[PDB]
Amino acid sequence: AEAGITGTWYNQLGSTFIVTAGADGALTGTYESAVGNAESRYVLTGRYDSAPATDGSGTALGWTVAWKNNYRNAHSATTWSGQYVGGAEARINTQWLLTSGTTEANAWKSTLVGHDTFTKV
Template sequence: MLSGVWYNQLGSQMTLIPAQDSGLTGLYTSAVGEADDVYVLAGRFDDNPPADPAAGLSIGWVVTYRNDQLNAHCTATWSGQFFVSPTGEERIVTHWLLALSTEPSAVWNSTNIGHDTFTRTKPSAAAIAQAHALTVGSPHPAHVLRNRTPHS
């Protein structure tokens, strides 16, 4: 059920290989940022689904952005649920944390949070552009605060 290729709303691709012991291995290719080439992923999933067919199956994995092309000095984790709709459509709905390497004084600013939905179908260029405009282009909160005008 989890095995195979998945795409998120920004066009990033992952290949999941579930193991008998609830382990996950695979590959992740990011469509955003400065990530080059393919990165190894590792994770876990609940291999004993809930009795309720509408309930999701818990899943989580981690990717450290280091390969032969680049060491970005950051690690991302995804945690979420795998769902199958009544029509058989599969999706993985997740929240992610991306931790960047920083100096101790900047640790408070070193982690980003977001969400991804993975499906079996690669999104169209128009859908990727829309998702990109809604998420990737968001300003950093410090930039918003710096440019805020005082209320009268």
Template sequence: MRMHLGICILVLVLGAVPVEPLPRSARATSCNSHNTQNQCAIAGIWRNQLLSEMTLTCQNGTLSGHYYSAVGNAEKEYDLIGRYVQVNSTEYIVGWSVAYKNQYRNARSVASWTGVYYATHGNIKTHWILASYVDPDNYQKTFNTNQDQFHKIGDLPCTQGVVG
């Protein structure tokens, strides 16, 4: 699956790069209600308005999973780590980060999202900031920021590995 980072400016800055989606067969059976790694309503597979996708598991205030960027200088999946706070019985404040370095590419950048899961709307509304390495003479070009809105598109497959 794929997820997008942000806005057209980000696409222009980094350039669009296609990524491989998760195999659809991996989503065949849901484990959200039976997996102890998924203790909150935000566990699952999410997609934003630019078609970037992420998987989230949650346990004891910690988010973990993978991010698949549909934009920018990204290739394949990247690890995601973050925290959540339960506001009431169904809603959460969330924050997570992705370092864009994996076995395929080092994009020399890190993105962080912070936002709110609204159960009544079924989405996570976020603000993000992307920091990319540039030489010191161009420091003003280091940061990009905008908003994303994620919608849940599925539950986690039973084959999803448990993240410690």
């Protein structure tokens, strides 16, 4: 559970994200996706509950990745919102929103939604 968010995680797509969880709620690290107009690592920043409940619940967290790095700019940003659950097999279950910058004309179709499950395997 605590600390354990820190590590390298992988999702079903093969994306990899390396995060560091700070004692007070911050999440910092890099994200490398396996799909989209992405190329290399991208910086990610987020927050998590540094004092989750002492009952059998997960730890709420979220993070953002703007898809711009020294190699590509896909003019989009993704936010993942979910919870971490530890145990012999820890995982982070998330739902995400990917918004692309559009002209007002196409704002209605600017956001994709999906889900990703991350494990340390």
